[PDB]
């Protein structure tokens, strides 16, 4: 029984009020501090005619204020459309249109939407009442994803899709003790692993500087703020293995997700220190990270497996007759669907699995299983 994100963050900030929530450069913000500003901004947002269900795009460079907006937007039940800060003004319009945004809140287009100054909203903060009744199935965010061919499709993600990240993952052993690094762009689903596994568990989220990755700054930041849970794309992981693999063993866990990573790169990383290196699978339509496989030995490693699902995630490889290859995902992370309701039927299908009908997302990832109970993608 998952509650909506603000309900979870509320009781998280009430439990651990004095723990550090956000770090930027050297500025620190505690959970009680963050909760007060979130409620103050949410009241400001309501003054600006924003109501529950409004489609609100966010374009704010990495900063403490960015994640206050995220919390405030979902506290007032808005549907956030995070936009990449280096996106060209033309692709901004395509994203706003495909999501049907009524607002764009930005720190720096032309369509049926209002542009709101993020700096002015922060300046207007004076908690105020009247907050919506939010369910786990209420929409929480829209993310754009491209397929093997088509144009960018909008994916409607429910509160449960990221609220599940409040539950500790057994393969990670994470808790409020941990520290996460925010480096993945907010327009990507992978960013949800870093933002919400932190804020919804009482852990710390150190924010990387805005812009393209600065591995020197990322190196000192990973150590200075003692990052324990490091999520990485395949490119950031491979580059670190090549130029500074020692950095990958300051944390306790390193999760590589996004695409096939050469098994030799995992071998160098695992043999380099005490950090548990993971291969992870995620997709936009399942809201965030979905499975994990722990690389155990330098010679234990044939595409590396993606492992076993996260809490409340169901992952099954079905045959060609929609029965048990091809990967299907069910559970709390499944998206509400696409903007196109007809393509929604094409790739979100109800399938009987162990007695009960279950809604599965059709991933289009050819796959098969391991002997030791492990999912393995194979293009
Ligand atoms: N890397 C993430 C972490 C959390 C949430 C989403 C993502 C993500 O890639 N969202 S996507 O929509 O842009 N891409 C989704 C598609 O990418 C591919 N893929 C993702 N992980 C892996 C992996 N370990 N090995 C091989 N292939 C992978 C797959 O074909 C999946 O269907
Ligand atoms: Cl700016
Ligand atoms: Cl997000
Ligand atoms: Cl940024």
The structural domains of the chain, with segments of one domain joined by +, span 5-160, 192-377
Question: Nearest residue CA, atom 20 of ligand 1?
Answer: 258
Phi, psi of 282 (to 5 degrees): -150, 160
- What would the two tokens of residue 52 be? 């529950």
Atom of ligand 1 nearest to the CA of 258: 1
Cα angle for residues 21, 239, 162 (degrees, 5° grid)? 35
For residue 73, count CB atoms less than 10 angstroms from its CB and return exposed for 0-12, middle for 13-18, buried for 19 or more.
Answer: buried
Q: Which residue has the tokens 């496989």?
A: 293
- Cβ neighbour number for residue 100 with a 10 Å cutoff: 15
CA angle centred on 85, ends 125 and 92, rounded to 5°: 100
Q: What is 192-377's CATH number, 3.40.50.12780, 3.30.1360.120, 3.10.20.740, 3.10.180.10?
A: 3.40.50.12780
Ligand 1 atom with minimal separation from the 377 CA? 26
152-162 in b/e form (b: 16+ CB < 10 A) is ebbbbbbbbbb
The ligand 1 atom nearest the CA atom of 306 = 24
Q: Tell which one of 259, 290, 292 to mutate to probe ligand 1, the residue whose CB is within 8 A of the most ligand atoms.
A: 259
Per the DSSP assignment, residues forming a β-bridge with 318 are: 326
Tokens of 107: 């720190």
Way the structure was solved = X-ray
Tokens of 307: 């492992």
Q: Which residues contact 67 (CB under 8 A, 6 or more apart)?
A: 22, 34, 182, 195, 199, 205, 207
Q: Whose CA is nearest to atom 11 of ligand 1?
A: 283
Tell me if 5-160 shares its fold with 192-377: yes
Pocket of ligand 1 (CB under 6 A): 145, 189-190, 193, 257-260, 279-284, 288-289, 306, 363, 365, 377
Residue 257 alpha carbon to ligand 1 centre in Å = 6
Query: Which residues are within 8 A (CB) of 230 and not within 5 positions of it... i.e. 6 or more apart?
Result: 180, 181, 222, 248, 251, 253, 254, 255
Contacts of residues 97-102 at CB distance under 8 Å and 24 or more positions apart, as own/partner, are: 98/144, 98/152, 98/153, 98/154, 98/339, 99/55, 99/57, 99/142, 99/144, 99/154, 99/339, 100/55, 100/339, 101/55, 101/56, 101/57, 102/54, 102/55, 102/56
Two structure tokens written together for 345: 């039927």
The CATH code belonging to domain 5-160 is 3.40.50.980
- Three-state SS string across the chain, please? CCCCHHHHHHHHHHHCCCCEEEEECCEEEEHHHHHHHHHHHHHHHHHCCCCCCCEEEEECCCCHHHHHHHHHHHHCCCEEEECCCCCCHHHHHHHHHHHCCCEEEECCCCCCCEEEEHHHHHHCCCCCCCCCCCCCCCEEEEEEECCCCCCCEEEEEEHHHHHHHHCCCCCCCCCCCCEEEECCCCCCCHHHHHHHHHHCCCCEEEECCCCCCCHHHHHHHHHHCCCCEEEECHHHHHHHHHHCHHHHHCCCEEEEECCCCCHHHHHHHHCCCCCEEEEEEECHHHCCEEEEEEECCCCCCCCCCCEEECCCEEEEEECCCCCCCEEEEEECCCCCEECCHHHHHHHEEEEEECCEEEEEEECCCCEEECCCCCEEECC
What is the rounded CA–CA span in Å between residue 340 and residue 348?
A: 12
Q: Which long-range contacts (CB under 8 A, 24 or more apart) does 356-362 make?
A: 358/314, 358/330, 359/330, 359/334, 360/314, 360/316, 360/318, 360/328, 360/329, 360/330, 360/334, 361/283, 361/285, 361/286, 361/328, 361/329, 361/330, 361/334, 361/335, 362/326, 362/328
Q: Can you give the length of the chain in residues?
A: 379
In units of Å, what resolution does this entry have?
Answer: 2.1
> Within 13 A of 320's CA, how many CA atoms are on the CB side?
0
Atom 30 of ligand 1, residue of closest alpha carbon: 365
Burial category of 91 from C-beta neighbours within 10 Å (exposed 0-12, middle 13-18, buried 19 and up): middle
Which one of 169, 260, 282, 293 would you pick to mutate in the ligand 1 pocket, going by the greatest count of ligand atoms within 8 A of its CB?
282
């Amino acid at each position: 029984q998952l509650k909506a994100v603000p309900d979870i963050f509320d009781e998280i900030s009430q439990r651990f009020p004095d723990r550090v929530a956000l770090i930027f450069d050297q500025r620190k913000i505690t959970y009680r501090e963050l909760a007060e500003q979130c409620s103050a901004l949410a009241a400001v947002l309501q003054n600006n005619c924003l109501i529950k269900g409004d489609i609100v795009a966010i374009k704010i460079e990495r900063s403490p204020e960015l994640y206050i907006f995220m919390l405030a937007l979902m506290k007032i039940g808005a549907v956030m459309v995070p936009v990449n800060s280096n996106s060209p003004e033309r692709y901004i319009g395509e994203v706003l249109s495909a999501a049907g945004a009524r607002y764009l809140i930005s720190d720096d287009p032309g369509g049926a939407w209002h542009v709101l100054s993020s700096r002015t909203l922060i300046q207007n903060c004076t908690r105020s009442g009247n907050y919506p009744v939010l369910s786990a199935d209420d929409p929480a965010l829209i993310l754009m994803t491209s397929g093997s061919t088509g144009k960018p499709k909008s994916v409607l993600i429910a509160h449960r899709g990221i609220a599940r990240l409040g539950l500790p993952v057994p393969a990670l052993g994470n808790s409020e003790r941990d520290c996460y690094l925010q480096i993945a762009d907010i327009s990507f689903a992978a960013s949800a692993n870093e933002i919400w596994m932190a804020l919804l568990t009482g852990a710390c989220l150190t924010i990387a500087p805005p812009g393209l990755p600065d591995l020197m700054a990322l190196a000192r930041q990973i150590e200075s703020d003692n990052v324990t849970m490091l999520f990485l794309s395949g490119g950031l992981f491979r580059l670190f293995v090549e130029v500074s693999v020692e950095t990958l063993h300051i944390p306790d866990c390193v999760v590589v997700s996004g695409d096939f990573v050469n098994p030799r790169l995992f071998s160098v990383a695992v043999q380099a220190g005490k950090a548990k290196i993971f291969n992870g699978l995620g997709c936009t339509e399942n809201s965030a990270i979905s499975s994990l496989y722990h690389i155990q030995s330098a010679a234990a490693l044939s595409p590396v497996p993606v492992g076993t699902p996260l809490p409340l995630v169901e992952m099954v490889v079905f045959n060609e007759r929609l029965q048990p290859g091809e990967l299907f995902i069910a559970g709390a992370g499944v998206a509400l669907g696409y903007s196109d309701p007809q393509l929604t039927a094409e790739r979100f299908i109800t399938i009987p699995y162990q007695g009960t009908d279950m809604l599965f997302y059709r991933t289009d990832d050819r796959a098969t299983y391991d002997q030791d109970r492990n999912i393995v993608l194979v293009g």
